[PDB]
Amino acid sequence: VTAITKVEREAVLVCELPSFDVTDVEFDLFRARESTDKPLDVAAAIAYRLLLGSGLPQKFGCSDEVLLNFILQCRKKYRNVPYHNFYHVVDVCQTIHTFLYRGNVYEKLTELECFVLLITALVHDLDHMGLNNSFYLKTESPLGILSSASGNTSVLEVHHCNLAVEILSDPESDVFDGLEGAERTLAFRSMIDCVLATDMAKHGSALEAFLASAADQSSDEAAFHRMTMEIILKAGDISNVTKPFDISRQWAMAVTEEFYRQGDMEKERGVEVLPMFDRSKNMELAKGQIGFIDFVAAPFFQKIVDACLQGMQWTVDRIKSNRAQWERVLETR
Ligand SMILES: COc1ccc(C2=NN(C3CCN(c4nc(N)nc5ccccc45)CC3)C(=O)[C@@H]3CC=CC[C@H]23)cc1OC
Ligand SMILES: [Mg+2]
Ligand SMILES: [Zn+2]
């Protein structure tokens, strides 16, 4: 399929990104994009550098050549939407790295499992089209029909897995080619399982199952590793509120635009439009983020940190302080 080539290849290798430390919890992807004419080659380099620097691809007989083909193969599959673009999955990959190596979550998993997670971040939203699963079902869209007929409500997540598998059948872009037997099976199994678990419809059930496993010393060990990978991918996804406020705010600008556009399309089609998707209300960013923090993200991070993931306490602290900063935008309005 397609083939990347040196033209695109080198176009990434000749980015050096001197101003930053990709390993830092305060790494700023917004700066990186802004700091060149080629934001797409910069993002790729950040992924490339993160993966190579972990020394995980080498360990699992993944050469640099195949690695970069893989990244680049994913990039093509991402579109140009406000939020669910290739910058979001590069973000997720970089954030997951910080949770593994600064939050010491590496200790709870094998190297293969850390390698799979870093990879899975990049395939997790392949060919996302700005539109949530709901839209596909309410518009009786062909992908919603296929999902509905096929027995799986996770319209996009199955889509992303399909594309991810595609990319890896080609061995010049197959970052698991060096795995054999049980390891290769696990890599695909867990990668798919993780991606499917990013469907926010399943958020409660996946959080309650990870916690019940974490509190049980007799939990099946393979099942705990798996749920931990699922929880970490989920964490990367909702990690925007754990960043430095200014980075957080810009993430929230991007999603708020993306939601607005779906809601524009939901008006045209004539289908139901939720409050959140409606440009008609200015819809105070502050109150949106405060609600997202109180109902989804603060309880999530606090609970997994306490159960198990004590190294990630900083996520709970930054949420707490990002919240207080939104309350001070309210108090001074
Ligand atoms: C930067 O800031 C955001 C980034 C991503 C998302 C994402 N949001 N969501 C939904 C998650 C659940 N929601 C709310 N639920 C419940 N119980 N209460 C709420 C109260 C107030 C607002 C929302 C909710 C709806 C949105 C996705 O599904 C995206 C796709 C995948 C993962 C997360 C994304 C939201 C952001 O800020 C609002
Ligand atoms: Mg997704
Ligand atoms: Zn995502």
> What is the DSSP secondary structure assignment for residue 23, as one 8-state letter?
T
Rounded Cα distance, 210 and 34, in Å: 38
Name the structure determination technique.
X-ray
Q: Which ligand has an atom closest to residue 299 CA?
A: 1
- Is the CB of 251 inside a 6 Å radius of any atom of ligand 1? yes
Rounded Cα distance, 248 and 70, in Å: 28
- Is the CB of 238 inside a 6 Å radius of any atom of ligand 1? yes
Buried (b) or exposed (e) across 315-326, using 16+ Cβ within 10 A?
bbebbeebbeeb
Residue 44 to residues 61, 116, 158, 271: CA-CA distances in angstroms?
A: 21, 18, 24, 38
Buried (b) or exposed (e) across 169-198, using 16+ Cβ within 10 A?
ebeebbbbbbbeeeebebbbebbbbbbbbb
Span from the CA of 217 to the centroid of ligand 2 (angstroms): 31
Residue of 202, 251, 255, 292 to mutate, ligand 1, most atoms within 8 A of C-beta: 292
Cα–chain-centroid distance for residue 100? Answer: 14
| Cα-based angle 116, 250, 164 (whole degrees, multiple of 5) | 25
Sequence letter at residue 148: S
- Is the CB of 258 inside a 6 Å radius of any atom of ligand 1? no
Two tokens, residue 51:
């993966």
Q: Which ligand has an atom closest to residue 128 CA?
A: 2
Rounded Cα distance, 195 and 201, in Å: 13
- Tell me the DSSP string of 26-58: T--HHHHHHTSS-HHHHHHHHHHHHHHHHTHHH
So which residues are the catalytic ones? Answer: 84
| Residues in the chain, overall count | 333
Rounded Cα distance, 256 and 250, in Å: 10
What is the residue extent of each domain of the chain?
1-333
Residue located nearest, by CA, to atom 33 of ligand 1 = 238
Span from the CA of 6 to the centroid of ligand 2 (angstroms): 30
Tokens 């296929």 belong to which residue? Answer: 146
Nearest CA-CA partner of 267 in 157, 158, 139, 140 = 139
User: From the alpha carbon of 295, which atom of ligand 1 is closest?
Assistant: 18
Rounded Cα distance, 251 and 143, in Å: 27
- Is the CB of 178 inside a 6 Å radius of any atom of ligand 1? no
Span from the CA of 126 to the centroid of ligand 1 (angstroms): 19
Q: Which ligand has an atom closest to residue 197 CA?
A: 2
> CB–CB of 13/67 below 8 Å?
no
Annotated binding site for Mg(2+): 125, 157
User: From the alpha carbon of 294, which atom of ligand 1 is closest?
Assistant: 20
Rounded Cα distance, 106 and 98, in Å: 10
Span from the CA of 296 to the centroid of ligand 1 (angstroms): 7
Q: How would CATH label the architecture of 1-333?
A: Orthogonal Bundle (1.10)
